[PDB]
Symmetry: D2
Amino acid sequence: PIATPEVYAEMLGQAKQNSYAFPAINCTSSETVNAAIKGFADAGSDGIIQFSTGGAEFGSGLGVKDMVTGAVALAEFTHVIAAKYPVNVALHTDHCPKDKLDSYVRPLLAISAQRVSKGGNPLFQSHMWDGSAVPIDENLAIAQELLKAAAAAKIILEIEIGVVGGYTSPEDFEKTIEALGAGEHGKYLLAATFGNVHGVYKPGNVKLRPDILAQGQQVAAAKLGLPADAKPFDFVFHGGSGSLKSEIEEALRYGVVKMNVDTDTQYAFTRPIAGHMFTNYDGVLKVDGEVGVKKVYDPRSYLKKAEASMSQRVVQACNDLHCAGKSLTHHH
Amino acid sequence: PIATPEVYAEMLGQAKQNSYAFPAINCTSSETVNAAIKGFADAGSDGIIQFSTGGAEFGSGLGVKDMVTGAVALAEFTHVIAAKYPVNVALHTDHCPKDKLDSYVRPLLAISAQRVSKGGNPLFQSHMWDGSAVPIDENLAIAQELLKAAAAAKIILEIEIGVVGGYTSPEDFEKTIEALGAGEHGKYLLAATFGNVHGVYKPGNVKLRPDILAQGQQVAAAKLGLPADAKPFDFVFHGGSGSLKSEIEEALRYGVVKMNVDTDTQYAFTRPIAGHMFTNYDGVLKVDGEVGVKKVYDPRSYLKKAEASMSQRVVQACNDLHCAGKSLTHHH
Amino acid sequence: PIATPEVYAEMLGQAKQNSYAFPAINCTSSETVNAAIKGFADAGSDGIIQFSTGGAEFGSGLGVKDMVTGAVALAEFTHVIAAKYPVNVALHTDHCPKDKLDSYVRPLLAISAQRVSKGGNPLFQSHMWDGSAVPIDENLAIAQELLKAAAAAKIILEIEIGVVGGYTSPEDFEKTIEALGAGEHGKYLLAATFGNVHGVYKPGNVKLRPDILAQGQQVAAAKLGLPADAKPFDFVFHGGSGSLKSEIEEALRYGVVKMNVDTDTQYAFTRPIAGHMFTNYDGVLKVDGEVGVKKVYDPRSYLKKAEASMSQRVVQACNDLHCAGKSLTHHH
Amino acid sequence: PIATPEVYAEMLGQAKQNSYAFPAINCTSSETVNAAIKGFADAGSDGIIQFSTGGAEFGSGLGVKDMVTGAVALAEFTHVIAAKYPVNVALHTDHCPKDKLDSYVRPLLAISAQRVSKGGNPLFQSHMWDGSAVPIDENLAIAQELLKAAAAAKIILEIEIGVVGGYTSPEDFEKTIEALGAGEHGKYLLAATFGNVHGVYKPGNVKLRPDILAQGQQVAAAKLGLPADAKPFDFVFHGGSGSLKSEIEEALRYGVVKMNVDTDTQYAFTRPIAGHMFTNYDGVLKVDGEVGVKKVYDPRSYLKKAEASMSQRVVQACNDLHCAGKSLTHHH
Ligand SMILES: O=C(COP(=O)(O)O)[C@@H](O)[C@H](O)[C@H](O)COP(=O)(O)O
Ligand SMILES: O=C(COP(=O)(O)O)[C@@H](O)[C@H](O)[C@H](O)COP(=O)(O)O
Ligand SMILES: O=C(COP(=O)(O)O)[C@@H](O)[C@H](O)[C@H](O)COP(=O)(O)O
Ligand SMILES: O=C(COP(=O)(O)O)[C@@H](O)[C@H](O)[C@H](O)COP(=O)(O)O
Ligand code: NA
Ligand code: NA
Ligand code: NA
Ligand code: NA
Ligand SMILES: [Zn+2]
Ligand SMILES: [Zn+2]
Ligand SMILES: [Zn+2]
Ligand SMILES: [Zn+2]
Ligand SMILES: [Zn+2]
Ligand SMILES: [Zn+2]
Ligand SMILES: [Zn+2]
Ligand SMILES: [Zn+2]
């Protein structure tokens, strides 16, 4: 099913308590949503499907190019699909900067607030406010008001401090606890930067500093008067693709509950499509006066392979993050 | 917008009256739906999006493989998208044989009946019952009961007499009018076979006999006591891909209001994907120890091109069928 | 065997007498030479292998880029190969303009003159002087001196009047007979231009005017005091690829004895190489950390297919030109 | 130039004395010969071009399939080309088993014996007798008679003890010295097996035991009454492709003077051809009614790239084997 707000909160609480995390898979289409959910289900795992501003625009089609439309359309699709799987699937929106709040996160929050006012649940279960490009005080001012609105709509807010490549300071960690508390005013997720980078580069290139996350937890624990081993933050690991297994493991120890994956699932989706086009070149092209071969230019022929391959990469993510076999539905 | 039942009936009435037809484009995904609707809009045309049993299964994902789920999920997606376009978009389900009625058309009819009972409109605006594999009397017995159910849910029924390749007889035309009337008991569309073939073959191979359709109209007109030039049937032209322009023109003269297209839009969708994989071979594959190029293995990079190409083929269909520039929204 | 000068003269005499012609296939390598000769043999035909200035440069390798070296190296290769086939194979050099005479045709003539001085036969059996870019009188002045040198080395000279696309005038035909005679001072071949074009374009684009050739023969016949149906010129048809069968047939009627083919045999050679790379993409590339598949990146694996395909196109040329089954070895 | 027998003997003597070796590059065509020689020249190195039985058959064309013809034709080509480069190029034939001696090595020896009888030099400068599939005594009996014939024709014989994958024993090393001496009855090259394997596999898979070669030299030195550090054998390293740099270095220390390379130069040749076909897919194929693009289906367009790439891999071999910059022409 789609994760209810209560189930999603329980998911994130259980992950933190047990030092595991969920994959948050960027999706752009019916096929990619289907691939992600099947991956979660094959791993016996709960999971998160997320739409970026560009993913939402793409989902709305070239004739519309509207983020809200694409996110709503893909979310409605996902609601129907997820009902047919035993695992819990949460819907999330990715990076939304200041100049897109009025045309992405705010209108989506309003849609969910209307649903909740009628006794229903929100359309999305979390939204990201990415204020990393503005000063920390402005970032957290906007975050505080969005957190109030989100919590009232039964939605978790993700925020970002520091810019992910394409480090978070002790004072920025302190300011975050001061402005937002530690969940008692509404749950929030913190994308803290620790040398992580969006994209996939050669092994060695990306140098992660998970000690930054350890330090952040210690800073928060001290502020809140908690024991030194407390983990008050629910961290989000952006730029998960291409990471070493050992790096993921270390991040889990310090309270990462959500690792975002896009690039690696993109490669997994595209890889069999490329293979299909090459091995069926004279079927997908009308060559030498011939009319091609419908069986292989039917988009389903290669998109099924794309789907299955992306699902396998999602299963790998669930095993890397130690959420495999832990779905809160306990269907086993 | 999505075509209301009233608008869809008006669409088909206007098409018949003016000797034009609408494309019915088989779709399987968010991208193909988006491509089809953008094509209709670019042509200033109303249009039909249809899901086959296999298309619906595909739309539900490999982890579900359920026709109803896929059709509902894709229909819900389409409802959100179509609201953002000025043209009218009708939703249809394609070939449903006897052994799939209980797991496709009937449950979908029930969903729409529930919507209509609450003062809303149906999810789909037409459904196909394909009884061509059973004797004509059984075909029309099932058709009569489905027509009653469909009309009560504000839905048009498509039926089929004769098997499309992969001819309809005067007596079968007569039996159809006798069993179903001529629209006064609910509108229905008739897929009569006249040498048409699903798929795309070399020019010349497919030999159409549109005189069969002319004869059918004359048979119906005589039965109903109408003038010899009356067109009591709303015909559906299956196997539209690969047809000569002149063949399409002749079919229009005899009351074809709906021409189904799948194979040609499949080729149009896939063609730029093939091209993308070849020209970006060392970006979509990790070759010689390199890590590929995200910008070109991002599925959106080639799927945008696929979408645009399929939309162009849909525009061509609207111009071939003479529905271009005739959308009943008259947005111009 | 390699055509002796006597056999080559007999070949061209028999072709003219019987209104057929030989293909002159541009070659660039051991594989293309092998493909051409096998094509002649499969057709039971004599034939001509020719090297352009660029083909010769290519044959010499990137480390040499010397026309004489490449032509000699490929000719020596061809002498060994042709001895193993029952058909007669003549060696020819293609377009040599004024500024390349000193570095292509003249040094090659000198090599053959040395061979002949020792009681042997020439290395090449014909050479082309292409003076079409200089005024006709200068063209024919150079031609006359080259004809003397060529005939003394038992070599046939090809000349060109008019520029082939990328028409020959009555006066230019007259001047040619006046300057060179009609074979009694040494045989020569005349590349007269008649709307022919190097390269392959869409059907219709190239508009041939074989009546120009008919007129040329009539002009020569009148000059020589021969009957009006005499064919004093041995014509060469440049730009043979892409021609209609009927166009080739008409050219034969007017004394074409040699039709040059390059572009169509290039396509035939490359076509299966392209196919091989696509269907074996993950064998010819080291992908995803794998080491490829030697069996398919071994150049012989695709070059055998290239060879066989080019040979088939050469067989087609022999049947188009009506030289198939007519080899002067009469091996049958 | 082509290596004279005297120069080739000096090459191998200098290599042994200075602990370096020459690449022996398998070639199959004019393009591959040109690529190999250009690689030697670019590295300022002497080198060896070799033809296998299959390479020779391929070189003769599908219409001939004769090893002697192909080897002679390619050798004659190579003689013309090599004269234009400052470095010394030796010609060699690769693996010839017992049942092919009468149709490969023996007839080639006879051709060279005839040349030498007339005061000239042999066509090839070395030939391989591969008797590894027969018992050692029979192998060396045939080797002794072939060595006499080869030496009389100014040709070096290569022999093989042990079968290369797809170890040489102290007694087999001893028997070799006993039967053939240490060069005083004619120079010979010894392909001793030491865990080497033809082909290219993943790193680690091939486990070389160069200590076998060290042991062989010690066994020979003891037999001949030489100091323990003497290197009486000139070793040949079959299966050179895919080897670690450090493995090559160790083999050099023990008297390898010739390392055979085929698979890696095959990959280098094919790799840009594959790339060319993919990036020019709509030029090398006639697609959607178009006629392709001659500029990219001209075989020279991709074969130049193939040549250059193979030459680069040959330069790498010369640097790996430490023969780069050491050509005995000292042209610098
Ligand atoms: O952290 C993430 C994944 O990083 P990688 O897994 O790609 O390293 C996501 O949050 C990215 O920001 C997202 O893929 C960007 O999507 P786009 O704006 O292109 O639609
Ligand atoms: O008439 C039609 C189009 O014919 P063509 O345009 O393809 O000739 C449709 O009704 C086809 O039956 C449909 O494409 C079959 O879809 P599938 O069962 O493969 O999902
Ligand atoms: O007439 C000919 C063939 O014409 P097509 O058969 O190609 O139309 C030949 O003489 C051409 O001039 C020759 O292919 C040019 O070769 P290049 O200078 O590129 O090495
Ligand atoms: O040692 C060699 C190279 O090994 P690799 O460099 O390929 O490992 C050669 O002697 C091989 O036996 C030769 O490539 C076989 O050629 P083929 O019989 O296929 O025409
Ligand atoms: Na990353
Ligand atoms: Na069709
Ligand atoms: Na041409
Ligand atoms: Na090897
Ligand atoms: Zn991110
Ligand atoms: Zn459990
Ligand atoms: Zn159909
Ligand atoms: Zn209007
Ligand atoms: Zn030409
Ligand atoms: Zn005969
Ligand atoms: Zn070997
Ligand atoms: Zn020196």
